[PDB]
Design a binder for this molecule. Structure first.
Ligand code: HEB
Ligand code: HEB
Ligand code: HEB
Ligand SMILES: [Cl-]
Lengths: 111, 111, 110
C-alpha cells in the first residue's frame, strides 16, 4: 500500500485526525472550526494526512477560521495546521487550502 | 480568474500537471505512461485538476498503466492518481476514467 | 450522446449536481438558495453543467442569494458558482445568469 512511506497515525480519533493533533493548542476561536464533518471526504476520519489535502474539508475549516478569528489567532492557527500536516508527511504547502481561502485568511490576520 | 477557488498549482511543469504530482512516487512501470501528451485536451499542460477529468487524457494514461504495470503496482498507481486529483480539488471519484479503462486496470491488478 | 465531450460527473447527488460541488464552501446564507428545486429545468438533477446554464434555475439561485446574502458573502458565493461551473466544462461566463440577476447580485454585494 502506498501509505507506508508516511509516518504511522492512530487509526482512531476523538474528533478527527486533523483536529486531534492541534485541538488543545489552537486559539479558542478556531476550536469549532476543526470539528468540521469528514463525511464529504474520501478520508478515513482518523487520517490526518488525507484531511490536510482535501480542499472541500480544509477550505471549510479555513473559511470558518477566517470568519471567527482575527490577527495573531489566524497566524497561530495556520502555523499549527501546517505543523500537524507536515509531521503527517504531507508535501509543501502542507495544509492544502483553496487560494481564495488563503486570501481570506491573510485578510483576517491583518485586520 | 475562475479557478482561484481551488488549491494553487505551479504554472509550469517538467512533464505535465498530473505527472509532476506523482512521478517520483509511482511505480517505474508507469513513469512513461504519465508522459501522455496533453495536446488533445483543453487543459493547460500544468493543470492537474483539468488533467484529472478529461477522459481522452485520463483514459489514455489508464490504458497505458493497464498494459505496463501488474499487481500491486497498478493499485498503488491508482491510489496515487486519486490522491493527487483529490488534492487538486476534483470531485469524486477524483481520477476520472472511463469504465472500460477501469476494468482493464482491475484485471492488470490481479496478475 | 453529445454530452460525452465534458468532464464526467457522478449521476447521483445529495442535493443536486450544482449544490453538491459547492455546498460546504458557500456562505451559510446561500445554503438554502442552492437547494432550489431543479423541477423547472430539463437537467438531470445531478448534471452540474446543465444547472450552470439553465437561466430559470441559475436565476432562482441568484435571486435567492441576492436576497439572503450581503457583502463578501455574495462575492464569495459567486466565485464558487463560477469556479465549479468552469471546472465542469461550461463556457464563459460559466455561471450563466439572466442580466437582471447579475445586477441584483451586484447591488447586494455593496
Ligand atoms: C483519497 C483518499 C486518500 C487520500 C487523499 C489520502 C492521503 C493521505 N493518507 Fe490516507 N488512507 C486512505 C485514503 C486517502 N489517504 C485510505 C482509504 C486508508 C486506509 C487503507 C485501508 O484501510 O486499507 C488510508 C490510510 C493511511 C495511512 C495508514 C497506513 C497504514 O496503516 O500503514 C496513513 C499513514 C495515511 C496517510 C496519508 C497521507 C500522509 C496522505 C496525504 C498526504 N493514510
Ligand atoms: C475545459 C477547461 C478546464 C477544465 C475542465 C478545468 C478543470 C479544472 N481546473 Fe483548470 N484552467 C483552465 C481550464 C480548465 N480547467 C484554464 C483555461 C486555466 C487558465 C485560466 C487563466 O489563466 O485565465 C485554468 C487554470 C486553473 C488553475 C490556476 C488558476 C490560477 O491562476 O491560480 C487551477 C488551480 C485550476 C484547477 C482546476 C481544477 C481543480 C479543475 C477540475 C476540477 N485550473
Ligand atoms: C437542456 C438539456 C441539457 C443541457 C443544456 C445540458 C448542458 C450540459 N450538460 Fe448535460 N445532459 C442532459 C441535458 C442537458 N445538459 C441530459 C438529458 C443528459 C442524459 C444523457 C442523455 O440524455 O443522452 C445529460 C448528460 C450529461 C453528462 C453525462 C454524459 C454521459 O452520458 O456520460 C454530462 C457530463 C453533461 C454535462 C453537461 C454540461 C457541461 C453542460 C453545459 C455546459 N450532461
Ligand atoms: Cl496520496
Amino acid at each position: 500500500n502506498p501509505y507506508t512511506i508516511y509516518p504511522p497515525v492512530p487509526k482512531t480519533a476523538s474528533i478527527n485526525g486533523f483536529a486531534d493533533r492541534i485541538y488543545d493548542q489552537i486559539p479558542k476561536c478556531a476550536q469549532e472550526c476543526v470539528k468540521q464533518s469528514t463525511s464529504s471526504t474520501p478520508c478515513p476520519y482518523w487520517d490526518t494526512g488525507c484531511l490536510c489535502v482535501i480542499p472541500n474539508f480544509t477550505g471549510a475549516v479555513g473559511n470558518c477560521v477566517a470568519s471567527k478569528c482575527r490577527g495573531a489567532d489566524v497566524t497561530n492557527f495556520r502555523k499549527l495546521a501546517v505543523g500537524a500536516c507536515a509531521a503527517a508527511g504531507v508535501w509543501d504547502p502542507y495544509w492544502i487550502i483553496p487560494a481564495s481561502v488563503s486570501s481570506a485568511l491573510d485578510a483576517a490576520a491583518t485586520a
